[PDB]
């Protein structure tokens, strides 16, 4: 977007002042949309010396004469040319600027407009900037942030020592990563993305995407009327153990609820019987194990079961011991079908296996599993979309890095998912998602498409739960998937 502004000005010939005017008026219109008539409110506009603060002077100027009171507190040392131009207009139009922030000033205003820092913030905020932001956050006034709440790193969503908590953020052209990843997502409040006149070609040259309803609706596979179960694919799920008997069941129904034709589980006997007692539409093949866990002695049987399916999911509830590790790695080296690799299959995975596979794969780690897989800390990998991109590219796979915002990438295209709620922070949630992804692959979506649709729909289903989200369980999530699909259409 720095690129996008520069190109719009330098190559397309749009005057910087036109962009800045459009940014500021877009903030006004956005506030009106959220507050109603603006004329009763008093506005405190906090402006830095950069272009963000310039946008703020435009906001302030456009409120003059129309609202109850406007005051600008200018907090910088110097002004960019556009900020200087708009400061001059604000004063010429009769506007009041002070250069000292006094805590009691918050008392006399209803709305604070945060135009302190935008995407130009570098480094921790200390000093009187930090004091001011902390005062604004303790004030309980309505806070509207220009472009990004001040203090959020727009590239990562990290807080740079302290940041404004906004009720409404108005950003320009495209959402920034910092609105999408946490903590920045939380500090953004309600986000509006305003069109300020960039050419639509530049806006679409973006290589990272937010997963939207329209994108997902266009990817949902077709249901031709003259179909039969084979039309919609066949999934094998290799899952479960004497310790973890529920995981197979949640993964399997995950596949069936998204429209897959046939779902087959391979589960150690007698845990396999748990599945059909709950959902008799599942096929749950008993696997004879020595001690309740898959091992190399089950390799040949699992390969045979795989010949007649379109995709294999492996990992939920497998356990992790050496014999599982030997099984998982030899199976995946030999399997010539797409694989969806989750949970304990990730914990025991030899990544050299991924590189040698001809067939595609999707990996679905949470950050703990990701950390183990690349030998880094959770803090190193969490929300680290560049690391995910590198890993997907090096291993020729799709990586679905799960968290409140989920990252889906094949190394060329990266998508961010923002559906879902904290009801998914509960055991069993991931197992359902694995099934959904396998299912969509079996129906004909590419690994990347299947992943994109599944993460969105899994989160949206959670949001359809009718009672308090903390009481959501995976079994209810399953029930809600077809509603999410209906609503998506």
């Amino acid at each position: 977007m720095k690129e996008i502004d520069e190109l719009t000005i330098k190559e397309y010939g749009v005057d910087s002042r036109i962009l800045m005017e459009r940014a500021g008026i877009s903030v006004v219109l956005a506030m009106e949309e959220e507050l109603g008539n603006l004329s009763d409110y008093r506005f405190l506009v906090l402006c830095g010396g950069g272009n963000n603060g310039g946008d703020g002077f435009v906001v302030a100027r456009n409120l003059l004469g129309v609202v109850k009171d406007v005051l600008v507190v200018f907090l910088g040392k110097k002004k960019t040319p556009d900020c200087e131009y708009n400061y001059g207009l604000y004063k010429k139009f009769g506007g009041k600027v002070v250069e000292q922030f006094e805590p009691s000033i918050l008392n006399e205003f209803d709305v604070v407009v945060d135009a302190i820092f935008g995407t130009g913030l570098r480094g921790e905020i200390t000093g009187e900037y930090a004091e001011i932001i902390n005062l604004v956050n303790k004030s309980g006034k309505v806070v509207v942030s220009v472009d990004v709440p001040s203090g959020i790193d727009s590239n990562t969503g990290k807080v740079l020592r302290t940041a404004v908590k906004a009720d409404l953020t108005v950003t320009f052209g495209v959402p920034k990563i910092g609105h999408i990843l946490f903590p920045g997502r939380d500090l953004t409040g309600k986000l509006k993305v305003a069109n300020i006149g960039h050419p639509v070609h530049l806006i679409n040259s973006i290589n990272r995407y937010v997963i939207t309803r329209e994108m997902v609706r266009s990817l949902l596979p077709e249901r031709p009327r003259d179909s039969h179960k084979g039309t919609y694919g066949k999934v094998l799920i290799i899952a479960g153990s004497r310790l973890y008997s529920g995981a197979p069941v949640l993964s399997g129904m995950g596949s069936l609820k998204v429209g897959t034709g046939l779902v087959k589980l391979a589960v150690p006997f007698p845990q396999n019987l748990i599945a059909t007692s709950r959902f008799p539409e599942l096929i749950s093949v008993p696997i004879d194990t020595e001690k309740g866990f898959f091992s190399l002695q089950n390799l040949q049987e699992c390969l045979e079961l795989s010949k007649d399916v379109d995709v294999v999911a492996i990992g939920p509830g497998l356990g992790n011991n050496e014999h599982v590790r030997e099984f998982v790695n030899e199976f995946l080296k030999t399997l010539e079908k797409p694989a969806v690799i989750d949970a304990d299959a990730i914990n025991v995975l030899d990544t050299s296996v991924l590189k040698e596979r001809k067939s595609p794969a999707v990996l679905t780690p949470h950050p703990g599993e990701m950390a183990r897989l690349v030998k880094k800390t959770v803090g190193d990998v969490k929300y680290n979309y560049e690391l995910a991109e590198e890993f997907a590219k090096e291993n020729d796979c799709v990586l679905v890095l799960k968290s409140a915002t989920t990252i889906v990438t094949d190394g060329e295209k990266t998508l961010f998912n923002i559906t879902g709620n904290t009801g998914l922070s509960k055991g069993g949630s991931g197992d359902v998602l694995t099934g959904m992804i396998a299912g969509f692959i079996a129906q004909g979506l590419s690994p990347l498409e299947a992943s994109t649709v599944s993460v969105y729909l899994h989160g949206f289903a959670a949001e359809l739960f009718e009672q308090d989200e903390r009481g959501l369980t995976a079994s209810e999530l399953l029930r809600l998937i077809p509603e999410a699909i209906r609503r998506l259409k």
Binding site: S26, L29, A30, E33, L191, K192, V193, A194, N195
Partner: peptide, 7 residues
């Protein structure tokens, strides 16, 4: 309704 704003 979307010329100016995306939600």
């Amino acid at each position: 309704a979307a010329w100016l704003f995306e939600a």
